Design a binder for this molecule. Structure first.
Ligand SMILES: *[B-](O)(O)[C@H](C)NC(=O)c1c(F)cccc1F
Ligand SMILES: *[B-](O)(O)[C@H](C)NC(=O)c1c(F)cccc1F
Ligand SMILES: [Cl-]
Ligand SMILES: [Cl-]
Ligand SMILES: [Cl-]
Ligand SMILES: [Cl-]
Ligand SMILES: [Cl-]
Ligand SMILES: [Cl-]
Ligand SMILES: [Cl-]
Ligand SMILES: [Cl-]
Ligand SMILES: [Cl-]
Ligand SMILES: [Cl-]
Ligand SMILES: [Cl-]
Ligand SMILES: [Cl-]
Ligand SMILES: [Cl-]
Ligand SMILES: [Cl-]
Ligand SMILES: [Cl-]
Ligand SMILES: [Cl-]
Ligand SMILES: [Cl-]
Ligand SMILES: [Cl-]
Ligand SMILES: [Cl-]
Ligand SMILES: [Cl-]
Ligand SMILES: [Cl-]
Ligand SMILES: [Cl-]
Ligand SMILES: [Cl-]
Ligand SMILES: [Cl-]
Ligand SMILES: [Cl-]
Ligand SMILES: [Cl-]
Ligand SMILES: [Cl-]
Ligand SMILES: [Cl-]
Ligand SMILES: [Cl-]
Ligand SMILES: [Cl-]
Ligand SMILES: [Cl-]
Ligand SMILES: [Cl-]
Ligand SMILES: [Cl-]
Ligand code: NA
Ligand code: NA
Lengths: 472, 476
């Protein structure tokens, strides 16, 4: 008889010939066994591409585990995962709104190891077996923005923490206006406002700039396990052309939280043969995906995404349920797809990341505040439930700017050092309030240029610069 | 022995002569009972309120009243609901610490009031009677700040037919008469905005312009305030609508919000409902004196706006705090307003459902500043706990009713950009066809909203209007 265990060695079940925990851990055990048998049999790369061969090797892995005498060690923490099960059972109903039963997926990951400590597969496996933590793929919407746009622009030294971006009206190449909610745009805006409010236009110019600088955006995303088939898409940074599991996407956030270092997500740490020989064991392959300056600058922006409360009530929800816990150093980001079909809230302290999705299995609209309110309230309860079952697991550490970060005094108005600039004839002495801007390059921000923001048409600049000029 | 009872007859305390009932409840109810006996004794003796103006006569009648209750056979019936009041004492004891924000021990006052009677069902008098006896529900007077706005500014203007729900006001930079800018936090202003936005964000300049309009129309603003029992010594103050020159108890202020919530009909606050002598003489009994302060159309339009103050969550996390503690209660029909004095010395949050109004203030006894989020967050979280404690003790007390527009309300189709009906306007030579998005705007007059004219907003300079009209013609 084979057995699957929790991280401490406690048997989950034995395998032979009714919850997520079983089928998820079994499924991944079987994946690891498949790689092992394919390697053991020296099956070539090209054979493994053949579908009849996959079927055979999948069936062999299943049988091997039924018939072998394997001990399979998972990353799962029995008390935590258990408390998450109870949390979804007790508080799942918070997610229901006008729109039918709202399904849900959550993944609690260790930021230092990528191990998964526990998860919510859905509202109630007995009613609905689909696994919303591991199998469901949905656009991550604006939770894309920190990873693929802003993070990468900072890492490449093309922007800093208080850099300015255009949220002026602009159209996609088809002539349609880029929209956010029901707004065509406003004007210039700091990266912090862009992120707190989740505006779309800033993210659109950010990606566009990366593309014009020839930046290897695919390299970044692939080092995190992301598979995006087409990068040549205007709305990519807003979630367009991307679909991900909660498990994979929680790994993107783990990378930001873990100071820019990726660790591959996993639920199985080891498989042992009857005799004791290691058939599979998880090997740490940390990767510095974003520089420490970049990750830690982003941690600071993401802390404010939550404390500003603009697109999620979370910090308020949690404060009411557990004010001590609410004082941990939470950072995060919300997502909402275009018709409110899917909501995401990703949360991290320095120790842990908690990814969260909700939506309907057949992809129809949630209520309008499903993500802003319902999901945030639910997650605050989940997060409390994890705390009760494992009271120091969240930790009390703060995120903190790496020493390699560079600090620049810049004009609040331009995101850039004070300077002479040419404004149509007349050269101006650009003056006004300064802020500390954080950069992940060598030299900090540049001097103020005419084209000071990320994005913006001529007209936009004319407009922005006349108010700047207006207040000197 | 005289006796002070809860509303149901349970004895709060007996009153004897002192040698030569350690709580806010005791002193508060005795203090009002004595005032009631004072009025009765002065009348019984037939003393004029030119005589009652003389200060030895006051002293005499106060001393007389105390002894009357000390030595007499009096049953005093309070309005205090025991199980509710007791839950509120437990709530401030258990959750009071949520208020301490680094600036010291933060003091607190609350009053729960029945909107259809003015009866005070319970109150919190401070953090802990034993530690500090100042009664922060009944005695303490502080500026109500921006919770002044709905009563003294927007509600009167709507009542007077001078604005409706989607009317536009100037938040453009303007100065006080002394030349200093009118500030809101660190902002010197923005541009035009709807009433609802003005209310959600609590901006100052729209409120200044609103009261200036009432003055210019010679509205009897004092008449309104005084019918709700407010005593403001000086109305000629530019910052009155923002709370400049007004100081109120929590108990009085709750009564103003009880007016708005009860469809514009005031009932005077009271904690004493009846005093009888052992011999049958009913010395005092509370008489209902309804006063229609705002029209029902005004009060119900105001309710709609204050619903959104809370649910927008701009100046208070209350609806979020409460959702997490009790989602079912959070779905009751909450309306309300926040206030913050200019150095964060005093935070107010006023809450209603159709049945009840709960007033709340926090600050320090010496008036120093709280932290910056004390009102936005700490007070809102504290009060969600309080509201929830009050519910658990009396599960139906908040009610499931909804606020709703009175059928006398007048609905108008207006431009979102102007708050006024679509049509032609003269913009500097060019007569222009004003077109665009419309909303339904609610009024409390006969004929609804006017046609758009050049000066479409409450407030604004020539410059401001140039700039807003400039913006409007790029749409069309
Ligand atoms: B974001 O706050 O989730 C914002 C609403 N993002 C989007 O608009 C967006 C998607 F969620 C998915 C594809 C494209 C897109 F612009
Ligand atoms: B309001 O949101 O409380 C707003 C801040 N009000 C004021 O600034 C204000 C006062 F609270 C008191 C007197 C004047 C004044 F402008
Ligand atoms: Cl499970
Ligand atoms: Cl375990
Ligand atoms: Cl790429
Ligand atoms: Cl992926
Ligand atoms: Cl490409
Ligand atoms: Cl795994
Ligand atoms: Cl680094
Ligand atoms: Cl916070
Ligand atoms: Cl909130
Ligand atoms: Cl469905
Ligand atoms: Cl909880
Ligand atoms: Cl830091
Ligand atoms: Cl510098
Ligand atoms: Cl550099
Ligand atoms: Cl230009
Ligand atoms: Cl242009
Ligand atoms: Cl008391
Ligand atoms: Cl009672
Ligand atoms: Cl002044
Ligand atoms: Cl007056
Ligand atoms: Cl008063
Ligand atoms: Cl006057
Ligand atoms: Cl009384
Ligand atoms: Cl008698
Ligand atoms: Cl009426
Ligand atoms: Cl709400
Ligand atoms: Cl509570
Ligand atoms: Cl209604
Ligand atoms: Cl009508
Ligand atoms: Cl009409
Ligand atoms: Cl009229
Ligand atoms: Cl003008
Ligand atoms: Cl002017
Ligand atoms: Na969002
Ligand atoms: Na306020």
């Amino acid at each position: 008889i084979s057995e699957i265990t929790y991280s401490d060695g406690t048997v989950i079940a034995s395998i032979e010939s009714r919850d997520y925990l079983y089928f998820t851990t079994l499924a991944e055990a079987q994946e690891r066994m498949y790689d092992y048998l394919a390697q053991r049999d020296n099956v070539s790369a090209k054979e493994l591409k053949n579908e009849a061969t996959q079927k055979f090797y999948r069936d062999l892995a299943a049988k091997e585990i039924e018939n072998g005498g394997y001990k399979i060690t998972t990353t799962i923490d029995q008390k935590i995962h258990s408390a998450m099960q109870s949390a979804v059972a007790d508080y799942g109903y918070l997610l229901d709104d006008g729109t039918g039963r709202v399904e849900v997926g959550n993944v609690l990951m260790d930021n230092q190891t990528g191990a998964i400590l526990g998860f919510v597969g859905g509202r109630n496996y007995q009613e609905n077996q689909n696994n919303h933590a591991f199998d469901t793929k949905r656009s991550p919407a604006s939770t894309t923005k920190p990873l693929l746009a802003y993070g990468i622009a900072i890492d490449q030294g093309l922007m800093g923490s208080e850099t300015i971006l255009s949220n002026y009206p602009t159209n996609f190449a088809n002539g349609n206006p880029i929209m956010y909610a029901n707004s065509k745009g406003t004007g210039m805006m700091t990266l912090g406002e862009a992120l707190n409010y989740s505006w779309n236009i800033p993210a659109y110019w950010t990606y566009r700039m990366l593309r014009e600088n020839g930046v290897d955006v695919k390299g970044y995303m692939e080092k995190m396990g992301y598979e995006i088939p087409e990068y040549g898409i205007e709305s990519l940074p807003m979630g367009g052309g991307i679909e991900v599991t909660v498990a994979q996407h929680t790994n993107g956030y783990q990378t930001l939280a873990n100071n820019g270092v990726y660790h591959q997500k996993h639920v199985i740490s080891k498989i042992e043969a009857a005799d004791g020989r290691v058939v599979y064991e998880y090997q740490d392959k940390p990767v510095q995906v974003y520089s420490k300056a970049t990750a830690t600058i982003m941690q600071g922006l993401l802390r404010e995404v939550l404390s500003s409360r603009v697109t999620t009530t979370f910090k308020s929800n949690l404060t009411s349920l557990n004010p001590t816990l609410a004082n941990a150093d939470w950072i995060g980001k919300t997502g909402t797809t275009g018709q409110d079909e899917n909501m995401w809230l990703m949360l991290s302290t320095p120790r842990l990341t908690l990814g969260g999705w909700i939506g309907h299995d057949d992809n129809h609209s949630l209520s309008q505040q499903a993500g802003y309110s319902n999901n945030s309230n639910y997650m605050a309860h989940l997060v409390n439930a994890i705390q009760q079952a494992s009271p120091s697991i969240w930790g009390n550490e703060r995120f903190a700017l790496d020493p390699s970060v560079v600090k620049s005094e810049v004009l609040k108005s331009t995101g850039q050092k004070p300077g002479k600039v040419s404004v149509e004839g007349k050269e101006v002495e650009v003056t006004g309030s300064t802020v500390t801007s954080y950069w992940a390059n060598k030299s900090g921000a540049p001097a103020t240029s005419y084209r000071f923001a990320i994005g913006g048409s001529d007209a936009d600049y004319q407009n922005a610069w006349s108010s700047i000029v207006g207040s000197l």
